Structure formats: structure tokens, C-alpha cells
Amino acid sequence: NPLTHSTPKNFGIGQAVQPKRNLSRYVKWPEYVRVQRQKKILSIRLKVPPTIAQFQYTLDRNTAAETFKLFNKYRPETAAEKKERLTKEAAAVSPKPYAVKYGLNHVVALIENKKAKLVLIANDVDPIELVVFLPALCKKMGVPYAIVKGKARLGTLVNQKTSAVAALTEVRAEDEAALAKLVSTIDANFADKYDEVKKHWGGGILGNKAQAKMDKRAKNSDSA
Amino acid sequence: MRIKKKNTRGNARNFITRSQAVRKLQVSLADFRRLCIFKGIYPREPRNKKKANKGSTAPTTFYYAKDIQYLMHEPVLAKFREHKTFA
Amino acid sequence: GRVIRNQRKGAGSIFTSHTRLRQGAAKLRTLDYAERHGYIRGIVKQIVHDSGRGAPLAKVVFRDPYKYRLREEIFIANEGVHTGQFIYAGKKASLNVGNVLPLGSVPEGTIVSNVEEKPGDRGALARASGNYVIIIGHNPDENKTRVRLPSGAKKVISSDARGVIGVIAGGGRVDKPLLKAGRAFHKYRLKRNSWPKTRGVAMNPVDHPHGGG
Amino acid sequence: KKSTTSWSTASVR
Amino acid sequence: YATVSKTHKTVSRAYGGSRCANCVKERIIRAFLIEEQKIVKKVVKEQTEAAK
RNA sequence: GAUGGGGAAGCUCCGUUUCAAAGGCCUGAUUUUAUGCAGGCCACCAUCGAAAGGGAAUCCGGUUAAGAUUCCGGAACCUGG
RNA sequence: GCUUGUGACGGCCCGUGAAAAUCCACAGGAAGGAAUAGUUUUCAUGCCAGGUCGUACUGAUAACCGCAGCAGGUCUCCAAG
RNA sequence: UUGACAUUGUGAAGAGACAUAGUUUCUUUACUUAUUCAAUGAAGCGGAGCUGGAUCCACGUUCUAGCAUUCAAGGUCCCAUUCGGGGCUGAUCCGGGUU
């Protein structure tokens, strides 16, 4: 095509106007976005005491999937089907219910009475003091527990938006073996595997540029 | 009376482009097209395209501003919003 | 006691600067990528008088590196700079009168003007007419530059700090006698209300500490 | 006919 | 100037109105000569790189 | 001289674009997931402050007890559509 | 000749002697536009409209201020032999 | 103007006490996350390229009062060619720091 020619643009300094580029790194974000990002960065940068840093160790993907598979079979009664049962109770005048136990006070009381077969504790609870004592309480009472990612996931378990805790107290005879196997799996995967590393402090992580400076200084010290 | 500004009266107020109509209705383009089909709103040709579109000769779809203002009161628009909330 | 003028001047009031006829604040360009890494060429469009300032000013037009338009800067004119001259600003600019360069990019004995105290503050030192700064030396390890100021002081500045090659034009202004209270009047009319001055001795004991006798 | 509210329709095509 | 035709406000040339004839002539000469010198500089730089 | 903010026990004070998610416009059969808005562009701060500064465009003749470049007659001009 | 407006100049400054609204022009070319038919409302003519408030009179040895119809004070234009 | 206490955090080295396993003080030297100053159009920062040429540089800009703007022309791969439309590149990659 003789009518089309190649006319390259010089994007150097003092040359043609710079093209549009991705300036996402330099965006002046809204104050709330900046606050949440810098808050997470500060949580990473500061040294974290062990009783808070223990919540960064959670179940693996497969074990969490199996746990939620077991709990979804005991998801509690909704508002619509409670109406159905009460209509049946009105005419008859119901079997024993099996349901996931939830509510912070209720589950803490069940742990103190040694009735919870398994306790799930959400990791992203704010304020964290609401569950910061729960692993130690479960250990002292001998209650099997697991820290899981997602209070929203626990909320979907108990028909809520969020849920700081979930508890399996009584299970059916067609799921008792699954519950026992899950307890042993959690003991091997979360209790014994993370028993020592939860006694350490966390969050001694440098920023990107500070880490690069430290590495360059160490290299210049070791060789010239 | 002070001097009046140009591009405000006549063709410039009589006709509204499709982008401006969609923005005023605060709906999507597909919902706007379906509303116009249901209500029988049809594109129009001004006798002076430059006067209607600020001197630009670029091809644009034009509507009647009063037709779009009448389309603002159609309850099917509220039904569309209800369906979106349900979805 | 009664408040003296030395204390009355702090409130502002009738003591503010007379800024109606000023051309604008005389500053260097904002230190950007072009001046940090390469250079940028601007053109001297005119050389103008600034009311209340001895030194003349130069209007220098650059091209915006990120948008199609022109950018206007107000420099203090160094002696020998003329209209239509090409000014070069950046780390890679040549050693010529009127060019803006970092203090680390110039050799020892270089005469500069409109020198930054900190890099990017757009000119702080040697701005009055006939004044200049001498590059005494360099400390590359700390990236510092030793300079001599018009008052004879020796200062240590960051080498990233910039300056204009040459000496501020309009020198020799103070060599001419005013001869006249009227010429002093017209001088301070464009600056501020600090003229005429009444001696504190001529004042009353309430008026001034030097008053009375 | 007359509007009692700020937002009215009144149905004139 | 809004009340008159375009003939009263222009002359029939590039930059008619805004710039006068001698300034237009000077910028035409300058554009042509500088573009030719740019071609010369590019050829010289490429030859110097090849011979280096 | 408000707002965003920040002081002050407080009536209120600072400051005037900052320290703010401060608002407009273009294209779309967005390769269709089947009734849910996608892709882009440009960016700066209210309001008040002059009947001597800036500023669209009108003249002559006649007329009243008292009006007059305003009314009457004739002749123009500007702005917007 | 007087007054006044304007032009081209000359002198003076360590004094070099407002801003904004608004209007026009250029550069550029997203585009649109004809053959038995288009284009151009920066050429002429033709059509329609222009709201609110002020408008009398004195402006001073009697209409303002000085307790007054007070020899005081109070900004400016035109100006004949 | 001077001193103390609080705001106030993290390491390494040299010195201490349980009578030669790590529980806390004194100095020395670093660090950044608090706090502080300044600027911007929060535009090009930091690090690395089997990137290139010779540890250093971009070899993309220095006779001249010109010009530089419409997802960038071009290269290449598709479409179903139709007035054109997509992707990679042109314009290296990575970052949990606007400078």
C-alpha cells in the first residue's frame, strides 16, 4: 500500500507528547481507601504479639471445604420453614432438631460446659478481643477448634450476614463418623502442625524499598 | 434584558442526542432502546444539524426533548428498576 | 506602654506588600522527570520590568511534556540573556548563561544564580540584582556541594539543587545616589510602607524606648 | 389538573 | 467584530489575520530550512555510527 | 467571605483551593450467556465587592401647568431565535 | 486665535505607570456535502421578541451638613466681545 | 533558656545480674512503622533486565523566535471484507511506598 507510511513517534524527553500510560500507582485515592490500605500495611509492618498473630494460621483449602460440607448439612431452620413446623405443631396438638450452634455468648457457654464437639472461629473479627481468648479457652476445656477464614462464610452457614463463631454440638448417626474424622484431620492439620509457630511473634516484614536498601547494603558489605 | 447565550434556544433545545437522553433517563442503553420501541419514540432530523449539535457535523441520533420528558413518566421504567432490584 | 511600629507591623494592616503591578512570583520550573533525567528547551519571549524589584524578569515558554499546550515561566533574567534565546533546563543541559542545571553537574568555580536551598523549592539564593553564588567544591559521597553566598557565607547544599548559570542582571543599581526624598518616595511606593522613618530619639518617652531626654 | 406535589405527571401526550 | 463579515477580519493567506506577511514568510523559511537540516543531521549521525 | 477541614468551654475563630469521592461530556448490537451499564475523555474550585473603572445597541423635530435621548411623528441600530 | 479631540514623535524614572467578563482571528481537520442535483443562514432581503427597578425638583448667602431660610463647609461638565 | 516524665517503636555489637542453656538494664551503631517538614498535574520512584552499546550511559531532543493535539502511523495475527472491527507490539518486567 503506497498510500500508508511509517511515522514513528519519539516519546523521549523534550520530544512528542507522552502517551496515555497506566498511572494506577500514582492515583490519589479517596481517604477511606488510603486509610484501609495503610492500616493493612501497618498491621504487616508492626511486630504482632503471638495471641493476635495466631489468627493468621487457618485451615487449608481442602480441610475448610470438608468442614463447610459437613456444616451445611446442619444449617439451621429458616424463617419460612419455622412457619411450616408451627402449623404442624398447631394441628398435632416435631422431631428433635440438629443445628449448628452460633452466637458468641452461647458458644462460649457451650465450651465452658464441654458440650461443643467442634468449634470454628472466624479470623477476621473486629474488634479482635471478641474471639482473642477463644483458642486458649478451647484448649483449656479440651474442645476441638479450628480458625477459619471468613465470618461471612460462617454467616452463610447460620443464615446471617456474618458470624464470629460456629459450633457443632450434637450430630446425626449418619454423620458421627465424618465428624470424628474431621476432628482427627483438624488435629493433624491445624492443632499439631501450627502448635509451635503460633507461639512466635509476627509481622516483622520490611517494605519493598526498605528491603531493597537492606539487600543492597548487605551486598556492598559482603563484596565490593 | 441582558444578552442571551447561544446554543441554548431553538434547535439546540428542541433536539436532544441519544447519549444525553440516556443520561437524563439514568437507564442503560438497552433499556432506553426498549422504552423507545414500546412508547413509539422515533429519531428526528433537524433542519440545521450544526445549530442542533453546536456546529459539529458528526452524525448523531436526535430525539425530541419533550418526547424524552414524556418518556420520563412511564411506569415501565419503574418496573425495569424493580426487576433489577429483584435480580 | 504604647505599642511601637516595630510591634505594630506584625498584624499586617497598612504594612502589607504592594503587589498590584507585579508580573508574578519569579520561580524555576517544578522539578519533574524531564529536568531530573534529561533536559527541556524553552524560549525567552520577553524581558520585562517588575515593579518593586531591581532585577528584570524573563518570560520563558516551554512545551508541556504531558499535554499539547504551552507553559509560561517567570525567571529572573541573568545578564546577557536576550529575547529569542533558547534556555535549557535539566540535569543534561550545557554550561551556558541562562541554562538551569543541578549544582552537582557544574564544575568548581561556576557562577550561578537563583539557587535552590533544597531541590525543588524553585530558587532561594542570589536573586537580587548583581548577585551570584560561587561553586566552591563538591562532596560526591554525601552528594553535597559547597558554595559561597553573596554575604560571604559558605553553605553546603544538596547537589540535586538547581541554579541558573550567570549573574543576576541589573547590577550596579545602588551606586547611583537617589538625591531626593521624592525618588525614595517613588521607590517605596511600589514596595511597602516603610518610608519615611522617624527616629526613636525624636519621639516621646511613651512612644519609643529611645524617646525623651 | 393543578399540581399539589412537586413531581407530577398529569397525562398529556 | 461579531457584526461584520469574514472579509473585514482576514486576509487571504495562511495565518491571515493573526500574523503579518513578513512574519509568515520568516516562519515558512525557518520551517523548511530546519526540516532540511534535520534530514542532514540524521544522515550524518547514521553515517558516523556506521563508520565508528 | 461560607463550604472541606482544623481550633475554641462557648458566643464563634482560622483559612479561600486547601487537606475533599467537590462534575460534566463522548461512543455503544462491547461477539452477544439471553430482563442487572460497558468502553472512554477533560479536569478546579461558592458568593459579594464600582450608578466616576470594563461594557451590545438611538437620533432629530414636536409636545406639558409640571415629563422627555423614555411620550408623539419620522428615521435607525443591537441581541437572541 | 480659544477650547477640545486625535496623530506621529521627543523627554523622565533604583517610579516603566489594573484585572476580569466579553468578542474576534488563526493553526488543526473529527466530519458532512453535488449531477439532473446538492451545499452555504460570517452576502442581501423577509418574520418574531426584548422582563424588573430608578427617572419630578434643589444641588445651595433659603430645598445637603452645621439645634436655623447660619457671611461657614461640600465632588464635577459647558463657557462669548 | 535548661532539665525531667509521657507521646515512644524494631534490630545488631560491646558490657551486666538467676550460680557457664537466654529473663531483663548501660552504652555503641543502624532501621522505620509513630510523629515532623516540603511539593505535585499525587507522571514516570525503587529493583531487575542472558534488554542493548561502551562499572557508565541511554546512541530518541543544542547553528535558526517554525511546527509538534483527534484510541499513533507502521509491523504482525484473526474476522468474513462492507463505509471496517478486535489482539500483540510500537512504548521490557516486577513492587503491599505519590515524591
Ligand SMILES: [Mg+2]
Ligand atoms: Mg518632643
Ligand SMILES: [Mg+2]
Ligand atoms: Mg472567616
Ligand SMILES: [Mg+2]
Ligand atoms: Mg458583583
Ligand SMILES: [Mg+2]
Ligand atoms: Mg462605567
Ligand SMILES: [Mg+2]
Ligand atoms: Mg425638566
Ligand SMILES: [Mg+2]
Ligand atoms: Mg419612538
Ligand SMILES: [Mg+2]
Ligand atoms: Mg429631569
Ligand SMILES: [Mg+2]
Ligand atoms: Mg438641613
Ligand SMILES: [Mg+2]
Ligand atoms: Mg443633627
